[PDB]
Amino acid sequence: WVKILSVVGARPQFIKAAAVSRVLRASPGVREVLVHTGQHYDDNMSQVFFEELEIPDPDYHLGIGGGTHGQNTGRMLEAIEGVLLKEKPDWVLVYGNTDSTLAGALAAVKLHIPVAHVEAGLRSFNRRMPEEINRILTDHASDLLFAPTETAVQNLLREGIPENRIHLVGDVMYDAALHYGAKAERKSRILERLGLQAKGYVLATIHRAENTDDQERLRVILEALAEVHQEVPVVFPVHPRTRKRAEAFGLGSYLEKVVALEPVGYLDMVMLEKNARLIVTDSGGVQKEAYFYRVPCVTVREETEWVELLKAEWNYLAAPQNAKDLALTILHRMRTKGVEIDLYGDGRASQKISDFLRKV
Amino acid sequence: WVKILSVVGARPQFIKAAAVSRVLRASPGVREVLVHTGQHYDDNMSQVFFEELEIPDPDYHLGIGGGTHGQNTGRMLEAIEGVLLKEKPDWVLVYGNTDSTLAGALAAVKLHIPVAHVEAGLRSFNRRMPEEINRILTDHASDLLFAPTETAVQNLLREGIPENRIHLVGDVMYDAALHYGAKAERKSRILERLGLQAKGYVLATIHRAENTDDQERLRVILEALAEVHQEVPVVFPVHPRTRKRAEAFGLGSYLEKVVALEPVGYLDMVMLEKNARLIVTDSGGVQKEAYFYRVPCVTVREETEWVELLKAEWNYLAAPQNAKDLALTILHRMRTKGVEIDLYGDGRASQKISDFLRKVGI
Numbered sequence: 095w096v097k098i099l100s101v102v103g104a105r106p107q108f109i110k111a112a113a114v115s116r117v118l119r120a121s122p123g124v125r126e127v128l129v130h131t132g133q134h135y136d137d138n139m140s141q142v143f144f145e146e147l148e149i150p151d152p153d154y155h156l157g158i159g160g161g162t163h164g165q166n167t168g169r170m171l172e173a174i175e176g177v178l179l180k181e182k183p184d185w186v187l188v189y190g191n192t193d194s195t196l197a198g199a200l201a202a203v204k205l206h207i208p209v210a211h212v213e214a215g216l217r218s219f220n221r222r223m224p225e226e227i228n229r230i231l232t233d234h235a236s237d238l239l240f241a242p243t244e245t246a247v248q249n250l251l252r253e254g255i256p257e258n259r260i261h262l263v264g265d266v267m268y269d270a271a272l273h274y275g276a277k278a279e280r281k282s283r284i285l286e287r288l289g290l291q292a293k294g295y296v297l298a299t300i301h302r303a304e305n306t307d308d309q310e311r312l313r314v315i316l317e318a319l320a321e322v323h324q325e326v327p328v329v330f331p332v333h334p335r336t337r338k339r340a341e342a343f344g345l346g347s348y349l350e351k352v353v354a355l356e357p358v359g360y361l362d363m364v365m366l367e368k369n370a371r372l373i374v375t376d377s378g379g380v381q382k383e384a385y386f387y388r389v390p391c392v393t394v395r396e397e398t399e400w401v402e403l404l405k406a407e408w409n410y411l412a413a414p415q416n417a418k419d420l421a422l423t424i425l426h427r428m429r430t431k432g433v434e435i436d437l438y439g440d441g442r443a444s445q446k447i448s449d450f451l452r453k454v
Numbered sequence: 455w456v457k458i459l460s461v462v463g464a465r466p467q468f469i470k471a472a473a474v475s476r477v478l479r480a481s482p483g484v485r486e487v488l489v490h491t492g493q494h495y496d497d498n499m500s501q502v503f504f505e506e507l508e509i510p511d512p513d514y515h516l517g518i519g520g521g522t523h524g525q526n527t528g529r530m531l532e533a534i535e536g537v538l539l540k541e542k543p544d545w546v547l548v549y550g551n552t553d554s555t556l557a558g559a560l561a562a563v564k565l566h567i568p569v570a571h572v573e574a575g576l577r578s579f580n581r582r583m584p585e586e587i588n589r590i591l592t593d594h595a596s597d598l599l600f601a602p603t604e605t606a607v608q609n610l611l612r613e614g615i616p617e618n619r620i621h622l623v624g625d626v627m628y629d630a631a632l633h634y635g636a637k638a639e640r641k642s643r644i645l646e647r648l649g650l651q652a653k654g655y656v657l658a659t660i661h662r663a664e665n666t667d668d669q670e671r672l673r674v675i676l677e678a679l680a681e682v683h684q685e686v687p688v689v690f691p692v693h694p695r696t697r698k699r700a701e702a703f704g705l706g707s708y709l710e711k712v713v714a715l716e717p718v719g720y721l722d723m724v725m726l727e728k729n730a731r732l733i734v735t736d737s738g739g740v741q742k743e744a745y746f747y748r749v750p751c752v753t754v755r756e757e758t759e760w761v762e763l764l765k766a767e768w769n770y771l772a773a774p775q776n777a778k779d780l781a782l783t784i785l786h787r788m789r790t791k792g793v794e795i796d797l798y799g800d801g802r803a804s805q806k807i808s809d810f811l812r813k814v815g816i
């Protein structure tokens with residue numbers, strides 16, 4: 095009998111936890127307790143994931159969100175701690191690299207509760223980025239480090255974390271893609287609703303702060319996607335923050351010139367990804383999922399944490415400096431492909447993690 | 455020309471800030487803002503240091519303290535972020551490794567305000583210490599790391615922190631002792647008051663969480679100090695957390711078997727340490743201060759961050775497993791001395807720190 099408490103706050107964490115939760119569910123002598131921080135609150139950012147991915151209702155919802163880093167992190171720290179004091183779990187699992195991840199880890203370590211980091215050791219090497227600080231500080235606070243890639247393992251060794259706390263387990267988001275693929279196939283009618291032809295569009299997601307808080311980068315991206323749309327329709331589920339920023343800077347009309355949507359559930363997303371001729375993104379999860387489906391990817395950033403996608407020629411960096419340059423880069427890359435190579439494991443990252451926990 | 459905001463919360467942070475702040479005040483093109491989180495709030499833990507060490511009143515008092523890690527750290531994080539969004543300093547300086555330290559770093563780093571950590575790179579290699587977590591994460595959140603020892607430099611390099619963000623500046627607590635030592639001698643009447651002569655007593659402080667939060671560990675310490683007291687008077691300024699734990703556990707009567715005091719100010723502390731025959735402590739700063747005055751030290755812990763003191767034989771660990779043994783250890787070490795060696799620098803760590811903050815560049 096072991097109690098594993100999972101802290102999730104954001105869409106990509108709901109998706110990670112859906113894989114790990116499934117395995118821990120049907121594991122003998124494990125009870126999972128699941129805490130939703132409230133970081134993501136809109137139904138299209140949160141509830142649709144619990145429904146479509148069949149995720150047990152959370153035991154706690156702390157309803158903390160939409161504030162500053164200080165506010166969100168600070169309140170999450172106090173609220174999560176209160177839950178840990180009640181539930182006394184054997185393990186705390188945190189996912190990814192948001193404020194929720196860091197608050198979960200830090201709440202737990204101060205109470206002498208072991209913390210395991212799902213998706214450990216990724217580095218952008220740009221420490222001005224909030225997400226890099228979150229990765230570094232979470233990794234250094236954790237007891238177990240579940241690395242998805244060899245690079246991630248090397249990044250942890252280089253920062254003095256001992257071998258014996260690092261397990262290369264592959265990527266749980268690959269597990270999720272595998273497990274939910276069929277259900278996406280039989281439930282998603284988004285190509286229908288959108289009048290899209292399989293391989294008759296490009297898929298785009300953009301929400302990095304460094305791309306949406308900076309008017310000139312955001313303008314380069316929306317200008318570039320509208321141009322690309324002239325040639326091949328662009329489907330663009332727009333993150334709420336991205337949509338806020340584009341409206342605020344007067345760039346809303348570019349969204350009207352493509353097939354812009356509110357955020358979609360995972361099942362639609364899978365169908366849009368699979369059927370896309372090419373994916374343009376600044377999302378970590380979406381650039382891996384592109385590779386899952388052997389759809390060429392352009393990452394609108396100066397670096398990625400997922401370097402093996404660049405090496406395997408499946409993914410290509412295009413920093414948003416020039417709208418025409420970026421447009422042409424997207425259009426050129428859609429008739430490219432990468433090498434045959436299996437990354438991210440066998441799709442049983444979640445049971446490797448289950449096993450390592452119930453042992454250690 | 456440059457605005458440097460310090461975050462302090464606890465007694466040892468006020469002493470460190472005293473030393474640095476004096477320098478920063480002399481420096482042209484340097485404005486300071488001091489934020490007192492409120493972590494330490496009693497006058498004999500906060501106010502007395504401001505007054506005797508000549509520190510100006512804090513620009514802000516957040517009045518947070520007395521809660522869990524969660525509550526204190528969380529509220530400090532939100533509160534400090536508010537101040538920083540008002541003051542928009544060029545640097546935030548954090549000291550040591552309390553919950554205040556970490557909340558200060560975390561507030562700052564997410565606003566892209568550069569953080570400098572005074573007393574950087576120390577490691578106990580014991581994560582059960584909240585303090586170990588605080589200094590690991592502070593260090594990894596910092597853009598400048600002011601290391602007091604070579605061990606601390608090596609600890610940082612081993613955790614992947616680049617050499618160019620690390621500077622071995624020595625210890626500002628040696629600067630403090632050096633700068634305030636004449637005033638202590640001039641003003642302190644503590645020895646007169648207690649009725650002690652030089653070398654006629656042992657000084658004790660105890661306040662680690664791992665020593666006070668466990669009933670029988672604390673009993674081991676208090677009982678050992680009672681025993682020592684029979685052979686050589688024991689003077690014991692008692693931390694409020696320690697008194698409170700001793701009360702709740704029903705161990706109050708042990709404090710009658712020694713010369714238990716309320717916390718003393720820095721000036722009285724210097725005179726107590728300076729004139730002690732031996733110091734027994736679980737304090738970080740007190741360990742070093744014992745060496746400053748060439749007084750043998752016994753550290754009542756399973757480890758210290760200040761390992762050079764053990765190697766120079768000025769300090770000796772004695773984990774509290776057994777009262778008779780801890781007593782005997784204490785009395786045995788009273789007759790010892792370490793090797794002559796200079797540690798902690800030249801008493802101008804603050805000046806080196808000021809210099810780096812000013813010339814680091816945009």
Ligand SMILES: CC(=O)N[C@H]1[C@@H](OP(=O)(O)OP(=O)(O)OC[C@H]2O[C@@H](n3ccc(=O)[nH]c3=O)[C@H](O)[C@@H]2O)O[C@H](C(=O)O)[C@@H](O)[C@@H]1NC(C)=O
Nearest residue numbers: 106107190191192216225331357358359360363377378379
């Ligand atoms: C750059 C960065 O730090 N990123 C971190 C960030 O993730 P991320 O950038 O992927 O955010 P995000 O794109 O919202 O979600 C993608 C998912 O949403 C689905 N997705 C996407 C759009 C949509 O409309 N519908 C939908 O279902 C997709 O199908 C896909 O499954 O938070 C993660 C977390 O903390 O767990 C970290 O692991 C990441 N760290 C890394 C290193 O990738």
Ligand SMILES: CC(=O)N[C@H]1[C@@H](OP(=O)(O)OP(=O)(O)OC[C@H]2O[C@@H](n3ccc(=O)[nH]c3=O)[C@H](O)[C@@H]2O)O[C@H](C(=O)O)[C@@H](O)[C@@H]1NC(C)=O
Nearest residue numbers: 466467550551552585691717718719720723737738739759
């Ligand atoms: C073990 C540990 O983590 N310790 C950390 C801790 O310090 P510390 O353990 O030394 O606490 P503490 O003993 O209350 O203060 C001593 C001072 O009080 C004076 N002092 C002491 C008693 C007294 O009655 N009067 C008085 O003036 C003494 O003269 C002396 O100058 O908080 C510090 C901080 O974050 O800045 C960190 O730098 C430390 N990290 C290290 C590594 O030493």
Ligand SMILES: O=c1ccn([C@@H]2O[C@H](COP(=O)(O)OP(=O)(O)O)[C@@H](O)[C@H]2O)c(=O)[nH]1
Nearest residue numbers: 104133134135136139160161192193334335
């Ligand atoms: O359900 C949600 C989640 C987020 N957001 C918006 O997206 C912003 C960024 O939120 P997030 O939690 O992603 O912050 P990050 O992890 O990027 O720091 C928020 O302030 C909101 O404006 C929203 O509108 N609805």
Ligand SMILES: O=c1ccn([C@@H]2O[C@H](COP(=O)(O)OP(=O)(O)O)[C@@H](O)[C@H]2O)c(=O)[nH]1
Nearest residue numbers: 493494495496499519520521661694695698
């Ligand atoms: O001025 C003060 C500061 C602290 N405390 C008590 O000491 C406890 C521990 O305080 P803190 O969490 O700052 O840690 P510590 O001072 O022991 O390192 C507090 O909860 C209070 O009960 C007190 O009585 N007066």
Ligand SMILES: [Cl-]
Nearest residue numbers: 299300301333
């Ligand atoms: Cl998005």
Ligand SMILES: [Cl-]
Nearest residue numbers: 659660661693
């Ligand atoms: Cl004390």
